[PDB]
Design an enzyme around this catalytic site. Structure first.
Site, PDB file in Angstrom:
ATOM      1  N   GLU A  21      -6.661  13.313   1.104  1.00 58.93           N
ATOM      2  CA  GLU A  21      -7.383  12.577   0.093  1.00 58.93           C
ATOM      3  C   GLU A  21      -7.745  13.566  -0.969  1.00 58.93           C
ATOM      4  O   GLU A  21      -7.877  14.936  -0.693  1.00 58.93           O
ATOM      5  CB  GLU A  21      -8.863  12.070   0.483  1.00 58.93           C
ATOM      6  N   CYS A  64      -5.957   7.103   0.901  1.00 52.55           N
ATOM      7  CA  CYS A  64      -4.769   7.625   1.841  1.00 52.55           C
ATOM      8  C   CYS A  64      -3.722   7.532   1.245  1.00 52.55           C
ATOM      9  O   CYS A  64      -2.933   6.772   1.674  1.00 52.55           O
ATOM     10  CB  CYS A  64      -4.877   7.175   3.042  1.00 52.55           C
TER      11      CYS A  64
END
Length: 226
Positions: free
Chosen positions: A104, A1
């Site tokens: 991501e 992240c």
DNA sequence: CGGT
């Protein structure tokens, strides 16, 4: 992240957590507008002090004076509470970073395809954070980290780790100065939003460039066009 | 001595 979106107004995030009487945060109707929040920038970070919620711009990253590597941006939930590095932050530096969702990059051969991940139920995410108090000093080396957990179920197709996302109720408890690190570990276990509550889709490769901050960055795309 |  390593990127996330924090794009809506303060009230859009705060309304799920506390009414004005519990806040010490000026009213501001302007959308935060950041669809591509990156490490090393200051990010509006929510925490509790003096019995009220405060929102401070805090450096995303943590590099104490003895750390000779790039600043860390994540702390693993499995070990952070007992880590020699993170234990003091787990005890007294807990915070919440609210967001619309996170990004991501899925490895696809030698190429990397970004995805945007968000709650299927359409609520914002309340990401568990730990950091160096006092947050209001605006430090440019010792800021906050996003706590991570293992990806599970469909999410593992994208990436092996994810932010520790808490329910609104658990997020409020996590911030309380009165609760111990041990109670915080219990909240992290009981309040974690499971993987099956998230949806995701590929997004434009443009999110890789931090110059881009527009709403198109979270829109679903055809992977074949990238 | 300390990590993702």
């Amino acid at each position: 992240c390593g990127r996330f979106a924090q794009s809506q107004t303060r009230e859009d995030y705060l309304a799920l957590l506390a009414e004005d009487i519990e806040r010490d945060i000026p009213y501001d109707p302007e959308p935060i507008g950041r669809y591509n929040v990156a490490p090393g920038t200051k990010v509006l970070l929510l925490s509790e002090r003096d019995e009220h919620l405060h929102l401070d711009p805090v450096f995303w990253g943590y590099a104490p004076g003895w750390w000779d590597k790039p600043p860390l941006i994540n702390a693993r939930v499995e070990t952070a509470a007992t880590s020699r590095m993170f234990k003091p932050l787990w005890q007294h530096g807990r915070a919440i970073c609210f967001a619309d969702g996170w990004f991501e990059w899925k490895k696809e051969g030698d190429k990397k395809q970004p995805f945007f991940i968000y709650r299927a139920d359409g609520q914002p995410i309340f990401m568990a954070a730990i950091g160096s108090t006092p947050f209001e000093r605006g430090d440019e080396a010792e800021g906050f980290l996003i706590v991570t957990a293992a990806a599970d179920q469909g999410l593992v197709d994208i990436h092996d780790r994810r932010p520790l996302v808490l329910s609104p109720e658990a997020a409020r408890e996590w911030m309380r100065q009165e609760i111990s690190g041990k109670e915080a570990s219990e909240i992290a276990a009981s309040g974690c939003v499971p993987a099956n509550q998230f949806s995701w889709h590929p997004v434009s490769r443009a999110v890789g460039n931090v110059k881009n901050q527009g709403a198109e960055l979270i829109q679903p795309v055809l992977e074949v066009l990238f």
